[PDB]
Design a protein around this ligand. Structure first.
Ligand code: URA
Ligand code: URA
Lengths: 201, 196
């Protein structure tokens, strides 16, 4: 309900993200996050009672940003338009918050020791629901027959790649997503491949 | 050489678990059944050994793409590449994860391999695939992005295995799920690049 409280939380989460990125979970101290955020350590602990709780909150915030378009899917949407928009929003996040994408990737590489409950609970429940929705679209003949979970994974993988594998992308192409021309070429290619791959025939 | 393979295999398992800075050459030598002196004969530094491990997964990954020739059937060639890449994610997930960790770090040790030999290969094979596009044997796509989608989509199933399992109950070590994954990744990419 409180905007001032919400802003303070965001400031702490933003400092935590940037710190957990430069130094890792075990290397990060709460005193470093508080200092970067301009808050007392006691104020930080009021909101996030441990380093573990704060780290999980940073990762839940990235999931929130990433999943917002998919959560919004309704049976009523134009499927190919909705999926196009989803791919574009995902690439914008890789362009704008690459450090979040990398932190999430690092937690996955570690076997999701702190995030596993969020994956098996709330994420699984969401993907189950939207998979049924997408399957309805297939039944209706609005999409070619594909397994929805694999479509979803393809979208995640293809768009996150440009953040997580940025040094390789740059080595190969000379560009990153912060080059506006390259950004646009990327969107156009990822969208064409996925959309023409699921368009009904 | 059987010794060199033992050292590389021990190194992969150790690095992929503990990271570069956390790994000791004494641990790798012990696992490989060699002295640290004998290890250093083959690999004169931890950096050299790490780079060797990462060049080996590059070699395995790139073999199908290196084989591409102008006169191949393009959709068939790409379809086969996707399958072979998923076989690698099933069989060598630790190597995929180690390579991903090196990328997340900004490729501090691997960057020269990426800007040198990798770039040269991708330039040659991008020209080849662009010739296929020019000829109307593929849809109007940009080859580098098609290549990146293949790498991303196939490597995802190793690198993000915890999430794939949390969501689906499966991994690529489950035969039904592996077959399903190949079928679906192939269908999306191949139908997305088929000329219309
Ligand atoms: O967009 C998403 C959502 C969940 N997990 C991912 O890897 N990406
Ligand atoms: O298959 C490959 C080859 C190079 N780099 C990757 O990420 N994947």
């Amino acid at each position: 309900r409180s905007r001032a409280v919400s802003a303070k939380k965001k400031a702490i989460l933003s400092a935590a993200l940037d710190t957990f990125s430069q130094f890792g979970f075990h290397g990060t101290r709460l005193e470093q996050i508080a200092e970067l955020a301009g808050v007392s350590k006691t104020n930080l602990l009021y909101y996030f009672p441990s380093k573990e709780a704060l780290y999980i909150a940073v990762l839940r915030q990235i999931l929130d940003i990433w999943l917002a378009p998919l959560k919004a899917f309704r049976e009523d949407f134009a499927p190919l338009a909705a999926i196009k928009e989803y791919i574009r929003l995902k690439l914008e996040v890789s362009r704008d918050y690459p450090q979040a994408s990398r932190l999430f990737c690092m937690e996955m590489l570690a076997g999701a020791p702190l995030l596993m409950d969020e994956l098996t609970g709330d994420l699984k429940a969401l993907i189950d629901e939207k998979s049924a929705l997408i399957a309805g679209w297939v039944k209706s003949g609005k999409l070619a027959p594909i397994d929805p979970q694999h479509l979803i994974f393809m979208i995640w993988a293809s768009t996150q790649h440009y953040a997580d594998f940025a040094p390789q992308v740059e080595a190969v192409t000379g560009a990153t997503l912060r080059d506006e021309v390259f950004f646009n070429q990327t969107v156009e290619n990822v969208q064409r491949i996925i959309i023409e791959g699921i368009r009904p025939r």
